[PDB]
Design a protein around this nucleic acid. Structure first.
Ligand code: BLS
Ligand code: MG
Ligand code: MG
Ligand code: MG
Ligand code: MG
Ligand code: MG
Ligand code: MG
Ligand code: MG
Ligand code: MG
Ligand code: MG
Ligand code: MG
Ligand code: MG
Ligand code: MG
Ligand code: MG
Ligand code: MG
Ligand code: MG
Ligand code: MG
Ligand code: MG
Ligand code: MG
Ligand code: MG
Ligand code: MG
Ligand code: MG
Ligand code: MG
Lengths: 293, 159
RNA sequence: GCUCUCCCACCCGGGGGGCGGGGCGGACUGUCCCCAGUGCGCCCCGGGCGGGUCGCGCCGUCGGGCCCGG
RNA sequence: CAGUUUUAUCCGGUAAAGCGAAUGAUUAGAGGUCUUGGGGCCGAAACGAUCUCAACCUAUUCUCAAACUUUAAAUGGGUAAGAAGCCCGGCUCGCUGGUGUGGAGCCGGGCGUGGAAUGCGAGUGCCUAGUGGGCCACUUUUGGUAAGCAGAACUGGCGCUGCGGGAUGAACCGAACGCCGGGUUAAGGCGCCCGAUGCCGACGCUCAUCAGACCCCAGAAAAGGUGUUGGUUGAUAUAGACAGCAGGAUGGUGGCCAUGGAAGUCGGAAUCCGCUAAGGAGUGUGUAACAACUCACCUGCCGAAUCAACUAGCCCUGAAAA
RNA sequence: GGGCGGUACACCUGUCAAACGGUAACGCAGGUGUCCUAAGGCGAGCUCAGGGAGGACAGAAACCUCCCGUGGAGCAGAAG
RNA sequence: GUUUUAAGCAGGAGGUGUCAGAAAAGUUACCACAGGGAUAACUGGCUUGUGGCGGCCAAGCGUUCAUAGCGACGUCGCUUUUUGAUCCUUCGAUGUCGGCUCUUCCUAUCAUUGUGAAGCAGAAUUCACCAAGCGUUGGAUUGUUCACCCACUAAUAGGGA
RNA sequence: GUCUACGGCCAUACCACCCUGAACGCGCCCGAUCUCGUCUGAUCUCGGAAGCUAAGCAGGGUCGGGCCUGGUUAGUACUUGGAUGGGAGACCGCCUGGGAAUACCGGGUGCUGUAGGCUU
RNA sequence: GUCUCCGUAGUGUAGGGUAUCACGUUCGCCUAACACGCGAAAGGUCCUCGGUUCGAAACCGGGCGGAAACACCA
């Protein structure tokens, strides 16, 4: 026989936390550093670069911050890839670098800095910190904002980082957590990173799964083989991402057929019905009471 | 002979209001503060860096300086008879705007609206604020019944 | 415009009721339901309350307009 | 410009209040399973059963707080109330930057119904005497049993200053001063000292063998009284009631078991209804007991009362100095 | 009154303080003349006291596991 | 003019706890001067806790019976003959303990005068009222105020100026 | 009507028990070659897609607690100024003006100022 | 004038998980009986109530009792 600890005097002295911490999507101690602008700047916005990982999808957005809630300028989803010809393994490191490139030259095709500030065309793996150009309008910068994903050594977020940088954005970084870093002697290779970019570690399953057993090649490759993709088609697309289909970056949001405006959620039971229910229950309990006994 | 510490007699003053503890909300910071604006000062116990001395909690002044994380400010104080004009350097948490100037900046505009209009009309529209005058003679209609006679209650010991 | 009580009807003049009554859609809960209670949307009719404003005629000033005007 | 007010605005944790809200203190019962024990208790054992005292849980209840608080006044503390403002062009920048972005500073032009109320001439700049032993009251307040004691906050006074009144008086109440005529008043006062009621003054309470008589102030109580004047609640009024010049109270029994002898007149669970305007095994005297008597409760003759309780007003006791 | 006895002789924390600030007495309850290469400076990761239900020797209290768990723990010392 | 040394300018350290910072143990009854009622020892003042005195209430004691006489736990007052508290007046001086002698005064009355109640039969004794005109002693020991003891007596009551 | 990043004091948004959930979505779920880590491939990291409505999810429900606002308590408590107003004193009345808080009884249970994809 | 110890079988008395000595005193051991010497008894509100505790008499006060102390300088 113990004391109930959720009393009235537990609910009176109980200040709730913030809504995004109750729904645990965020961090305010990691935001307060990233989002404020120094007061001698006077309404000069501070661009951050959101990267979100979902279990079937990748999201890459750009946004500064205001008092009315932080405001998007340019979004880049990862299921707009099968326009271009990558249909399977939609969320690997390769599409994490392809999306950050689609974001990069989307923004450059919304500001008017396409031909200037190209970035990298080839795919090598080394540092390409993009320097600004004298006389011309200056470079573009945006600070990263990963969030709640431990940035250890080999994350898919950084592939989107290397994509937007090689696209032309000027993001500060250092090659210490990229696939190819030796944690005992501190050097860095490029080809291990380019073996990890194009899809060769994904490919090697065309042996360890194609030889040793054949039953598991159909237990977990059931959409490559349905879309008729062999393990040698690890191929370039980036000239298609570069050329001209950011004149529809937004895909031209599709028109909206007129909806019936029908409802799928039962509305709130009113007052003058909740005052009527307990008269039914009191008369039913008294007419099923006095009759019986 | 009391002491002369930094935070004498501030048990209830730097304390947080009831059920408002915790994290400083993020629309306190990203508001903009120019030079010339009028600012009241309220202390706070969370961020200990850059507190004001306890004798400014409530005063109101204007800005002369803006820094990386702080603004300078000019206030007035009364020391043993005279009045000193002194200046401090306060971090952002301990600071709000004052809305005292705003109903004047709403009445400068309303007056210049009431002046640009109807001047070309040759009209003479009243501009000065005039205090609440003595109220007008007015009729009271008692349709039908009579006023209700009151009665002072006889005493009884309530307790 | 909003819509309580004199009173109105379901029910025993009153309480309960009221904004009532009529037609249609959908939703609702205890009871076997009938029930009836509610209740939103759409439409019609009845009923009083509440002043604004537009207006009317009549009564009401040892009234007001150089104490209007002939 | 202001020892002030109004209209807008923020700040504060005091008096009050509150424990069915936290932090601490605390009284009494109520339902439960034992959550555990010390003993009854049947028991070769029990939370089996136990009286439970008891703590334990839940809803309730009695009181509290300078170093405890959810709420939260009154007075009170800063700011703002237009030309030192607004609004249009434009320039420079080596800091800030996606973008002449972002700011700041500059040359120019345009706009006066003076933008709440009331009152008043203001601004700065030199040299410098005296002082640094302080006191009282209204409220607010800490130590102390208390002090014409000690110690702080707000305003005002004596000190520095007299004048009419308080019989007299450094501070209280009126009022602040050049020398003088006339008038009127303030706090106070008008039987005489002593200017003024030598009013046909108005309405009532009060008798002391210690009456009593005007802010600070010079003295006094708890409790008492059929001394009196008002008041309050119910219970007896042509319901002869409320005192008494009044007609009388026991045939069963002479109670039961009782006192040696007691019949009511002595002891005991008891205490009734039966012609009963009247039961009491007597309120009582008497007698060795009764006999003989009266009475609680009841029956005769006349023209308006009782019980407590406010100390409710004055008066008295309470109340002893050189 | 001096003396013997104390430190109100430099500092800080609550209270007296009369709701800004300031404010006294040999007025209260208390403490200091230091300690630390980490108990300083960054970053990742975790969440405490107490309470329940269980589990070999295990008991009032060793360790493990599950649930509730707005600070009831801790932050070198006095207290906020 | 050259080399050694010293003096120079700048920054830390060597400490003053009476902590805005002197280098410092006692006594005078053989004592001296400058001053103070801003500051003690007497009296007097305002106060009355302690001391002394008197009330109300009524559980019990009292062979029985609360209140003839007494009164528990509780509570309201006066007195300045005890000690304390304070520091207002006097330190260019108010002559400071006791006793002898000598007048007067108060009453909270020990005895005497006149009267009430008793657990008052008489004799004795306790209790209270009006009441201070009249009395209230002789001696041993101690510096004594205070105490203690022997006798007588009507009684050997208490104090102020 | 949903996903991403938010705003304000962050409760009208919390907690407890129930229930229905169309399509796109979010998620539990399938696994351990790839220098990601652990005593442990559960957590963290990666490569995935056969299969399905409990899910801080989403919406409604409780004569719910809790919270948010309104009446009562109350012109009560308190209080700035003043009086030769009582009273032995304690403290209480008056004029002048300001003026609260619980218990108790009622109503509400997320707006979304928000930008990008989406019941379309 | 009040602060410092400490109270415990009949006597006096040793000391966070039991109430302990020495003597007082009943029965039993060696002996030739005697003394000395020895072993088992009774004996406890560890001053009277409330809290710390899983368990306190030894921890905490409030309190009643006794004893031993102190009051200096006209
Ligand atoms: C010091 N003496 C005393 C004689 C002095 N010279 C003079 C004298 O009378 N002195 C004494 C006088 C007063 C002083 N005293 C006494 C009590 C008191 N409460 N306060 C004082 O000041 O005490 C002194 C004391 O004797 O010691 C001797 N050498 N005897
Ligand atoms: Mg208080
Ligand atoms: Mg004095
Ligand atoms: Mg004084
Ligand atoms: Mg004067
Ligand atoms: Mg003067
Ligand atoms: Mg006089
Ligand atoms: Mg006055
Ligand atoms: Mg006179
Ligand atoms: Mg104040
Ligand atoms: Mg530490
Ligand atoms: Mg000598
Ligand atoms: Mg000599
Ligand atoms: Mg003196
Ligand atoms: Mg004297
Ligand atoms: Mg006394
Ligand atoms: Mg008797
Ligand atoms: Mg003299
Ligand atoms: Mg002389
Ligand atoms: Mg007498
Ligand atoms: Mg929605
Ligand atoms: Mg369909
Ligand atoms: Mg509720």
């Amino acid at each position: 026989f113990v004391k109930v600890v959720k009393n009235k005097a537990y609910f009176k002295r109980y200040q709730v936390k913030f809504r995004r911490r109750r729904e645990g999507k965020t961090d305010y101690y990691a935001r307060k550093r990233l989002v404020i602008q120094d007061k001698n700047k006077y309404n000069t916005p501070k661009y951050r670069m959101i990267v979100r990982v979902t279990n079937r999808d990748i999201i890459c957005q750009i946004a500064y911050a205001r008092i009315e809630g932080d405001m998007i300028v340019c979004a880049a989803y990862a299921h707009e890839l099968p326009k271009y010809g990558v249909k399977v393994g939609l969320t690997n490191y390769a599409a994490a670098y392809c999306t950050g490139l689609l974001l990069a030259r989307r923004l450059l095709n919304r500001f008017g800095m396409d031909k200037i500030y190209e970035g990298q065309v080839e795919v090598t793996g080394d540092e390409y910190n993009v320097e600004s150009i004298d006389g011309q309008p200056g470079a573009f910068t945006c600070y990263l904002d990963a969030g709640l994903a431990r940035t250890t050594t080999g994350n898919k977020v950084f592939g989107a980082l290397k994509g937007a940088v090689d696209g032309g954005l000027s993001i500060p970084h250092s090659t210490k957590r990229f696939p190819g870093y030796d944690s005992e002697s501190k050097e860095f290779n490029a080809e291990v990173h380019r073996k990890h970019i194009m899809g060769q570690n994904v490919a090697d399953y065309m042996r360890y799964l194609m030889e040793e057993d054949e039953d598991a090649y159909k237990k977990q490759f059931s959409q490559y083989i349905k879309n008729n993709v062999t393990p040698d088609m690890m191929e370039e697309m980036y000239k298609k991402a570069h050329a001209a289909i950011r004149e529809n970056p937004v895909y031209e949001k599709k028109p909206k057929r007129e909806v019936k405006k029908k409802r799928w959620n039962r509305p709130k039971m009113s007052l003058a019905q909740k005052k009527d229910r307990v008269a039914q229950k009191k008369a039913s309990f008294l007419r099923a009471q006095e009759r019986a006994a | 002979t009391n002491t002369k510490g930094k935070r004498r007699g501030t048990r209830y003053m730097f304390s947080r209001p009831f059920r408002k503890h915790g994290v400083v909300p993020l629309a306190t910071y990203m508001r903009i503060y120019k030079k010339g604006d009028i600012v009241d000062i309220k202390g706070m116990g969370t961020v200990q860096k850059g507190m004001p001395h306890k004798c400014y909690h409530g005063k109101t002044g204007r800005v002369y300086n803006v820094t990386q994380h702080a603004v300078g400010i000019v206030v007035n104080k009364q020391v043993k008879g005279k009045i000193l004009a002194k200046r401090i350097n306060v971090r952002i948490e301990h600071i709000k705007h004052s809305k005292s100037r705003d109903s004047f900046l709403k009445r400068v505009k309303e007056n210049d609206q009431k002046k640009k209009e109807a001047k070309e009309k040759g009209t003479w529209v009243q501009l000065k604020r005039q205090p609440a005058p003595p109220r007008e003679a007015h009729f009271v209609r008692t349709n039908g019944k009579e006023p209700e006679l009151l009665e002072p209650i006889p005493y009884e010991f309530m307790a």
